[PDB]
Amino acid sequence: SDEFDALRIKWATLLTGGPALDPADSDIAARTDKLAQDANDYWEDMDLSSSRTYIWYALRGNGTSDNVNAVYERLRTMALAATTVGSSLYGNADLKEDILDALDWLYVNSYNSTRSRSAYNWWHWQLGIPMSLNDTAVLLYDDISAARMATYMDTIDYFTPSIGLTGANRAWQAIVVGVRAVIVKDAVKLAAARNGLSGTGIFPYATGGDGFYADGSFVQHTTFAYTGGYGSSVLETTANLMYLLSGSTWSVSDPNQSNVWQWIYEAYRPLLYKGAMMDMVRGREISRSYAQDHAVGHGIVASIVRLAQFAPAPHAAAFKQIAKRVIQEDTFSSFYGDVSTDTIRLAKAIVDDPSIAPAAAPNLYKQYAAMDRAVLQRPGFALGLALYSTRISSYESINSENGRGWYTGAGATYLYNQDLAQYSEDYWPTVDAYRIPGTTVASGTPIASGTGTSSWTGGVSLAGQYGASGMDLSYGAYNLSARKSWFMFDDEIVALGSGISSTAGIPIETVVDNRKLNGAGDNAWTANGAALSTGLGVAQTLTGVNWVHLAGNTADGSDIGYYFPGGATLQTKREARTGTWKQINNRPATPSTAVTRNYETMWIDHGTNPSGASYGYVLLPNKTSAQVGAYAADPAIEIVVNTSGVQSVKEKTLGLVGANFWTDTTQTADLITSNKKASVMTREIADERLEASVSDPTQANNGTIAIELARSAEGYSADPGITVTQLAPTIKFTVNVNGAKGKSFHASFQLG
Ligand SMILES: C[C@]1(C(=O)O)OC[C@H]2O[C@H](O)[C@@H](O)[C@@H](O)[C@@H]2O1
Ligand SMILES: [Ca+2]
């Protein structure tokens, strides 16, 4: 025996859960039954014929990478069901044989050195197929001969012999060369795998392009926020490879691995909400039925559990605490339901360890300036804001996936509450893709995939407690411009719109919300204190409404209230919509079965060719209609200004004032005066202290932002980069935003 053999067994238990597995456990058993069932289901359907032209009727066609990739996964599944303890097919030599025969069959008939390394969908030829193959190689390792185990590892080397791509792709190459390295007992390769993690898009932060950023953002394909998509994969593979290499002579030594710990804290933690990974950062993957938000979220948490096995002292315990809290929070879909058996083993030991307490829930506001995203986490709810600009594209759609992601990241709001299934249970293929909440669009017309023309997209963060965001809207697909802002406070989110103009000749509308209702679609809702009809298929206009209340799909924790300051007229309809995942993901393996969900859609109608139109609403999560009515009577909010040049909102009770300035001219909102495009927020504690945060959301100003506050101060402390030039009679200071990359600069003044 040698090291390589140790590593291989370590990976074998990663896939199986080792001989340790306790089939008595209800969840270990549940997973096992399915593996065996599915495995059995395939096997007893394979064409075992000597002269077969295919291994599975359904997957025939040696030329389509999609099919070939799937025949390998199936095999991998049977390998596991044949290798994991407790399985109805454990040890079954017959099964192992057939699997092996299937592999040989593909070496000559479909997967070998003949095919182009660049054939259609290299991902399958260079990463997908090989990852599965390795896993099989490791499991049936003993039952495999040298001649046989060569036709496997040689072909794999042919397709992926090096490491040299970006983030997710680079990491995948690394796990492919790394695993085939421990089976072929090669060290040169194995070290090239460990070293790969130090490459672009992984360990080292990125200042542009793919990879993780110091502000917690993650980018893939150069212009798309992908934390929950390709990012999800990166976390998983990197963690899996780092764990395999931990404690070996090929252990990771790069100092930047420390960054991996921060990924969890700043990159993933803020984007998880009770088991779900927010879709706004999942890209084109929101169109995949097998990968909805909680399923995807479980995988992220599994990578955390894995990470907690070798993580240094401080971090390991923190990880255990975070995972424990998430396993417990998710009452929608059981975590143990869709993760590997070894994952269930390791987690169960954390959840049952009484000494490990659940980490606290996050309570903050974070601006991911590098990917045009912003999050708000409050005890009762969370808000996801998806923006785009000259730096980040509207949405991604390649390989006929996500054909309706048009406005998924165009100022879209995502509200998370007790209704944990809002975005799961086939939301995407049934929701009206032309009406994504928070957005302003030309009714029923789409926009293309690509970056925008305005640089003003970002926001400011006041000590990570509160914030404000903005997006200068201007579509290329058709004439339409507007100024959209959002102000996140303690229990309400204010949305303002102005400069709404168009010549498209198409009715422009702003969608307040589009909520999926319960199975009956009978959620109770009220407007101005009057119950409204709850029948499906009914469309109605609400004139002069000051507030609306919609009951959630759960007894408590999912109600939503809407406040319209100067009164508004809403176009609404409640209906049952039908669709298929096939419609937003036209690939062979995607389900065509029709599904039906209920929605309550509400929007403001700006008319056709409007000029200077505007809107203003406040979202009030978890409040009863009686409260929403109360709020509307004596609101803690007060619109300071909603013009084309500046949008400002004040929070009477918190002493908060937010203001986004859209032009490089001198303008003033309440006590704030600015001379440049900027996002500002201040907090005033009567005769005590005054705080202020500023940011250049354009990330293009290479000079300064001259700010002036209408208050007299006695002293101050400011982040470096802020030069205060006058404390009395009024506060004056400048902010050096050259290369600030959208960050927020803070400063606190003591009043007299
Ligand atoms: C196996 C599958 C799939 O999801 O079907 O095939 C294609 C792959 O390439 C994409 O770039 C990734 O998003 C990855 O997640 C995909 O995995
Ligand atoms: Ca409030």
> Of 583, 613, 634, at which residue does a domain stop?
634
CA 662 – CA 644 distance, rounded (Å): 7
C-beta of residue 448 within 8 angstroms of C-beta of residue 477: yes
Q: How was this structure determined?
A: X-ray
Q: Is the peptide bond before 720 cis (omega within 30 degrees of 0)?
A: no
User: Could you tell me if 331 and 413 lie in one domain?
Assistant: no
Ligand nearest to the CA of 282: 1
Does the annotation list 289 as a binding residue? Answer: yes
Q: Domain count of the chain? A: 3
C-beta of residue 651 within 8 angstroms of C-beta of residue 629: no
Which pair of tokens denotes residue 478? 């058709």
- Alpha carbon of residue 188 to chain centroid: 36
**Residue 258 neighbours by CB under 8 Å, 6+ apart:** none
Which pair of tokens denotes residue 620? 């009030």
**Residue 373 neighbours by CB under 8 Å, 6+ apart:** 217, 225, 280, 281, 384, 385, 386, 387
Query: Residue-wise over 419-435: b if at least 16 C-beta within 10 A, else e?
Result: bbbbbbbbbbbbbbbbb
Pocket lining: 205 vs ligand 1, CB cutoff 6 Å: no
Residues 139/141/147/152 CA torsion (nearest 10 deg): 30
Phi, psi torsion values for 705, nearest 5 degrees:
-120, 115
CA 460 – CA 746 distance, rounded (Å): 10
Point out the ligand 1 atom lying closest to the alpha carbon of residue 128.
Answer: 1
Q: Long-range contacts for 422-425 (Cβ within 8 Å, ≥24 apart)?
A: 422/515, 422/516, 422/553, 423/276, 423/279, 423/292, 423/293, 424/276, 424/292, 424/293, 424/294, 424/295, 424/332, 424/333, 425/292, 425/516, 425/597
> Of 332, 361, 390, at which residue does a domain stop?
361
- Taking each helix axis from N to C end, the angle separating 26-43 and 341-351, rounded to the nearest 10 degrees, works out to 170
Which pair of tokens denotes residue 373? 């995203």
CA 12 – CA 80 distance, rounded (Å): 10
User: Could you tell me if 106 and 124 lie in one domain?
Assistant: yes
Does the annotation list 651 as a binding residue? Answer: yes
Which pair of tokens denotes residue 125? 């030829």
CA 273 – CA 421 distance, rounded (Å): 11
CA-nearest residue for atom 11, ligand 1, is 123
Q: Which of 190, 197, 302, 306 is nearest to 249 (CA)?
A: 190
Point out the ligand 1 atom lying closest to the alpha carbon of residue 285.
Answer: 13
Place of tokens 């992926």: 160
Pocket lining: 201 vs ligand 1, CB cutoff 6 Å: no
User: Could you tell me if 232 and 199 lie in one domain?
Assistant: yes
User: Could you tell me if 302 and 380 lie in one domain?
Assistant: no
Task: CATH number of the domain at 456, please.
Answer: 2.70.98.10
Q: Which of 202, 201, 179 is nearest to 190 (CA)?
A: 179
Pocket lining: 123 vs ligand 1, CB cutoff 6 Å: yes
Does the annotation list 399 as a binding residue? Answer: yes
CA 164 – CA 174 distance, rounded (Å): 9
CA 657 – CA 732 distance, rounded (Å): 17
C-beta of residue 516 within 8 angstroms of C-beta of residue 597: yes
Point out the ligand 1 atom lying closest to the alpha carbon of residue 589.
Answer: 5
Query: The domain containing residue 613 runs over which residues?
Result: 362-634
Pocket lining: 122 vs ligand 1, CB cutoff 6 Å: no
Task: CATH number of the domain at 656, please.
Answer: 2.60.220.10
Resolution to one decimal, Å: 2.4
User: Could you tell me if 240 and 169 lie in one domain?
Assistant: yes
Does the annotation list 169 as a binding residue? Answer: no
Q: 3-class SS at 102? A: helix
User: Could you tell me if 743 and 672 lie in one domain?
Assistant: yes
Pocket lining: 228 vs ligand 1, CB cutoff 6 Å: no
CA 459 – CA 466 distance, rounded (Å): 11
User: Could you tell me if 703 and 605 lie in one domain?
Assistant: no
CA-nearest residue for atom 12, ligand 1, is 230
Q: Find the DSSP H helices in 586-670.
A: 625-633
**Residue 7 neighbours by CB under 8 Å, 6+ apart:** 182, 244, 245, 248
CA-nearest residue for atom 14, ligand 1, is 230
Q: Which of 65, 123, 285, 402 to mutate to test the pocket of ligand 1 (most atoms within 8 A of CB)?
A: 123
User: Could you tell me if 547 and 669 lie in one domain?
Assistant: no
- Taking each helix axis from N to C end, the angle separating 3-16 and 65-83, rounded to the nearest 10 degrees, works out to 100
- Alpha carbon of residue 410 to chain centroid: 15
Residue 672 is which amino acid?
A: I
Q: 3-class SS at 407? A: coil
Cα 122 to middle of ligand 1, angstroms: 11
Ligand nearest to the CA of 65: 1
Q: Which of 205, 269, 224, 211 is nearest to 371 (CA)?
A: 224
Cα 530 to middle of ligand 2, angstroms: 24
Which pair of tokens denotes residue 144? 């495999």
Phi, psi torsion values for 669, nearest 5 degrees:
-120, 115
Cα 567 to middle of ligand 2, angstroms: 19
CA-nearest residue for atom 1, ligand 1, is 128
C-beta of residue 692 within 8 angstroms of C-beta of residue 709: yes
Q: Cα–Cα–Cα angle for 614, 619, 622, nearest 5°?
A: 170
> Of 580, 605, 634, at which residue does a domain stop?
634
DSSP labels, 285-346: GGG-TT--HHHHHHHHHHHHHHHTTT--HHHHHHHHHHHHHHHHH--SS-GGGGS-HHHHHH
Which pair of tokens denotes residue 94? 């017959």
Burial of 364 (0-12, 13-18, 19+ CB in 10 A): middle
User: Could you tell me if 373 and 491 lie in one domain?
Assistant: yes
Adjacent-strand bridge partners of 682: 657, 692
Cα 284 to middle of ligand 1, angstroms: 10
- Could you confirm whether 158 is annotated as catalytic? no
CA 85 – CA 71 distance, rounded (Å): 23
CA 136 – CA 130 distance, rounded (Å): 10
Ligand nearest to the CA of 623: 2
Cα 489 to middle of ligand 2, angstroms: 6
Point out the ligand 1 atom lying closest to the alpha carbon of residue 123.
Answer: 9
Which pair of tokens denotes residue 6? 């140790």
User: Could you tell me if 95 and 244 lie in one domain?
Assistant: yes
Q: Find the DSSP H helices in 532-674.
A: 625-633
User: Could you tell me if 332 and 446 lie in one domain?
Assistant: no
Ligand nearest to the CA of 637: 2
C-beta of residue 569 within 8 angstroms of C-beta of residue 604: yes
Adjacent-strand bridge partners of 649: 639, 658
Residue 385, number of CB atoms within 10 A of its CB? 26
User: Could you tell me if 595 and 654 lie in one domain?
Assistant: no
Q: Cα–Cα–Cα angle for 166, 169, 172, nearest 5°?
A: 130
Pocket lining: 128 vs ligand 1, CB cutoff 6 Å: yes
C-beta of residue 179 within 8 angstroms of C-beta of residue 171: no
CA 18 – CA 267 distance, rounded (Å): 31
Which one from 72, 152, 226, 230 is the annotated catalytic residue?
Answer: 230
CA 91 – CA 76 distance, rounded (Å): 15
Cα 394 to middle of ligand 1, angstroms: 21
Which pair of tokens denotes residue 503? 């010549």
Which pair of tokens denotes residue 437? 């909440």
Cα 549 to middle of ligand 2, angstroms: 17
